[PDB]
Structures are given as C-alpha cells and as structure tokens.
C-alpha cells in the first residue's frame, strides 16, 4: 500500500468539473447552422425529454414539438447514410481494391537502420470501430526487435439516450500487457450522472470512477479504487463551484478486502472571489488502515498584476511535519526574445529554486550575451 | 420646516387585483396528484426564471 502522502496528493488535485452530455448538430438546429454554448444543450436534452413526457400525457403542443424533432432527426439520419454511401463509393473509385495504409510510428534515431521494422507497423486502415487502440512503449526493449509491448483500449459512450437526447456518459480505458511470463492489466471506468439543469434548478452532477490494477508475476496482488464526487454550483453565492468527494482504496487479494489494507479519503473543493482576490482551494484528508494525512492546495490571483501566478501548498503528516511550498511564475518579452521565470520556495528544507527559460527566434544575440562557461571550462590536465 | 408640525409618511400600500385573486383562489392545486405535480413543475420553473 502506498503511503498516505500519495493519496493526499492524489486527492488534492484542484478544482474539478465532471463531463456533461454530448449533443447532435443536425437535430439541435433542426437542419440549421448552430454554434457552441453550454447550458443551451442540456436544456435541449431535458426539454425534449419533458416534452416527450407531456406529449405522452396528451398535450397537443408537446406532440407537435416532438413530431418536428422526429422529422428533423429522420432527415439527418438519412442524410448521414447517403453521405456514408457516397464516401464509400468515392473511396472505391480512388483506389479500386487497395485498402488505405497507415503511417508507421516513428521511434527515433538509433544506430540500427531507421527504415527497418517500418513494414511491421504499416497496416491497413481499420473500419469505423467504436474502440480506440494505442500502442504502449516500454523503457528498455529487445535489442533486435521492436520496443513496442502491450496495448491500450479507450472507449467512450452515452448509452440510455433516446433520439440523441439524455443518456449516461461513460468512459472506459484498459491497458493490457500479456506475455509468456508476465501480465499487466490496468482498468479504469468513469460514469456521469446529471440531476438538474440551470433552467430546471441548480447544476447538480455526480461522477463515479473506478480503477483497478493487476500485476500478476511481480506483485501477485490486485488493487481497487472507487471514488464518488458531487458537484454543485452557487452553493454559497452566485457561483462557487462547490464540490465534495469520497474515495475508498482496497488492496485485497480478490473482490472484498478480506482483511486487506483499506483507506478512506474525503476532499472538499471551492473557489471564492473576495475583493481583488480570486482564490481556488482544495483540501483533503486521508486515513489508512491508522495514520491520517492532510493536504491543501490554493491558487491565488491578483487582478492588478495579472502576469504573476501564485500557488500555495500545505501537506501535513500524521501527528506532524508540515511542509509549506510557494510557487510564483512570471513572463516578459526581452529584445527579440521571451523570458519566463519561475520561483519555488520551500520552508521545510529552507530552499529556493529559480528557473528562467529563454526563447529567441530573430537572431543569436542571447548566445553572444552568455559566454562565461567557455572561459570557465578548463582542461585541468 | 412646516412638515415638522405635520408629517404623515404613508406608503408601502400593495394593490391586488380582485379578478386575479378570485381566479387563483378558485383553483385547487393540492387535492389531486396530477394537479399537484403540474403545479410543482410550474412553480419550480417560475421561481427559477
């Protein structure tokens, strides 16, 4: 089981926002051009659901609205089918029988022939499948073979939707690395739920995430994590983006912990505008099975100096070493160049680190500006 | 300063329409479930907007 500091760092990510619904472009505009704006799409979702309910009830206007929506949806679907058929015909016309090929992944420079093993990664373009496939690259691979081991699948959907309105956003990601000796299986799933919309109430969203990790030969143990987060806007004002989350982590051999080490954490997140300061805060507390760790992150901005960015972090171990960190960032434009500076100060170790990045695209004036290391470099025998 | 001797500040009078008041008094929204549900939906939307 990882230390409580890792869990406290995971929980204190910052201000969060769950993913909303997805909307079709043909149905929303009834065959007309539309633009992008949130609040007007979830309104369309809930409005069409309510109008369907009222039409079932018997209101003639709801029936008329639903009939118009159905006509627009049918026209859009037929148009898309015709477009798909035309695209397939055009693809057949261009290449008579030859399926389209894909560009191989470029690994980089090496003493082996750079053009070698390119034929292995050049495959025919796949069909319009829902899943997405990505290759995973290991740190060190075989000397005389390709260094790509394993694969990862990514999938997204919005099921339980009627005519493109409503549904439950759902994301899945599975990384699988299987060989004759080892086995690495990492799965993650996200589910979104919406309770109300600004026209019909407040913005109430609940996100449930579940991630499990299995490493068969090395660890021989599996890990499960389940987190539920609730977000609501304007709890103590016009807009505060209040959020509260609860996470449970288990390291049992299988299924239930069965005496496995458990951990429970809770996090709170809120942003507030006081005077000239727009402060965003996220504070979490985690307890493993019996030390307890605390974490807090804050982002502070000053409207009179928009170029300066200030972040504060406070981490407390079990009672009780408190680590405080302050980070400041600034940017400016030099003569034909841009310089960005970052200062990080830690009081636990009493240390200050200053980094200045420089980019010049007009000439090499900055190169002639800095020449000390050349003289500083000595043979020394 | 003659208002010092006599100052009668009368205001805050609220005038309510007789017809509208009678019409909305004759409406029974709570004796039936469907009427209550419709009234709740309309009340939510109206209070929101």
């Amino acid at each position: 089981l990882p230390p409580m500091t890792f869990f406290v760092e995971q929980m204190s990510e910052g201000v969060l926002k769950p993913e909303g619904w997805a909307t079709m472009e043909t149905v929303a505009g009834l065959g007309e051009e539309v633009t992008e704006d949130e609040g007007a799409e979830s309104f369309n979702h809930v409005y069409y659901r309510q109008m369907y309910e009222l039409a079932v009830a018997g209101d003639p206007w709801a029936q008329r609205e639903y009939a118009a929506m159905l006509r627009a949806y049918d026209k859009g679907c037929e148009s898309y089918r015709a477009s798909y058929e035309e695209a397939d015909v055009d693809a057949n016309v261009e290449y008579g029988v030859e399926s389209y090929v894909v560009d191989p992944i470029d690994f980089g420079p090496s003493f082996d022939p750079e053009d070698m093993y390119s034929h292995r990664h050049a495959y025919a373009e796949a069909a319009d499948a829902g899943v997405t496939v990505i290759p995973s690259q290991d740190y060190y691979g075989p000397e005389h073979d390709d260094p790509l081991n394993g694969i990862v699948f990514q999938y997204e959907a919005q099921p339980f939707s009627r005519h493109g309105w409503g549904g439950v956003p759902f994301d899945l990601t599975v990384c699988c690395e299987k060989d004759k000796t080892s086995l690495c299986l990492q799965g993650e799933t996200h589910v979104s739920l919406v309770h109300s919309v600004p026209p019909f109430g407040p913005r109430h969203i609940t996100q449930v995430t579940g991630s499990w990790e299995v490493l068969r030969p090395n660890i021989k143990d599996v890990m499960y994590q389940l987190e539920v987060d609730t977000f609501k806007d304007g709890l103590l004002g016009k807009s505060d983006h209040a959020g509260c989350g609860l996470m449970l982590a288990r390291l049992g051999e299988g299924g239930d912990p069965r005496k496995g080490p458990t951990a429970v954490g809770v996090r709170l997140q809120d942003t507030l505008r006081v005077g000239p300061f727009k402060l965003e805060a996220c504070a979490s507390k985690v307890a493993v099975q019996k030390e307890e760790g605390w974490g807090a992150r804050a982002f502070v901005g000053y409207d009179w100096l928009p170029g300066l960015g200030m972040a504060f972090d406070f981490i407390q171990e079990r009672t009780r070493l408190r680590g405080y960190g302050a980070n400041f960032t600034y940017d400016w434009e030099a003569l034909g160049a841009a310089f960005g500076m970052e200062v990080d100060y830690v009081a636990a170790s009493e240390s200050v680190f200053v980094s200045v990045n420089a980019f010049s695209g007009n000439d090499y004036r900055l190169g002639w500006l800095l020449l000390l290391p050349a003289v500083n470099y000595f043979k020394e025998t | 300063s003659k208002e010092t001797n006599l100052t009668t500040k009368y205001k805050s009078q609220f005038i309510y329409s007789k017809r509208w008041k009678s019409i909305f008094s004759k409406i029974q929204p709570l004796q039936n479930g469907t009427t209550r549900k419709s009234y709740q939906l309309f009340r939510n939307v109206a209070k929101q907007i």
Binding site: A28, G29, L30, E32, E33, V34, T35, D37, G39, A40, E41, F43, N44, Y47, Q50, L54, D59, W61, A62, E65, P199 | I23, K26, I27, Q28, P29, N32, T35, S38, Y39, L41, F42, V45, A46, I49
Partner: peptide, 29 residues
C-alpha cells in the same frame, strides 16, 4: 372550471424559453 390552468402555463413557459434564450441558431445568427 380552472383545474388545467397551471398545466397550460407550464407547457407555454418552457416552450417560450426555447424560442427566446436557449436557441442555438438564433445565437449563431
């Protein structure tokens, strides 16, 4: 009898909202 009145209001109000606020084509124009 005025049992239906609230319903006839609700089916109106949101509908009117759909025409005046949350209309993407109108916003685009």
């Amino acid at each position: 009898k005025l049992n239906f009145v609230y319903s006839e209001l609700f089916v109106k109000l949101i509908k009117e909202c759909k025409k005046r606020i949350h209309d993407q084509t109108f916003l685009k124009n």
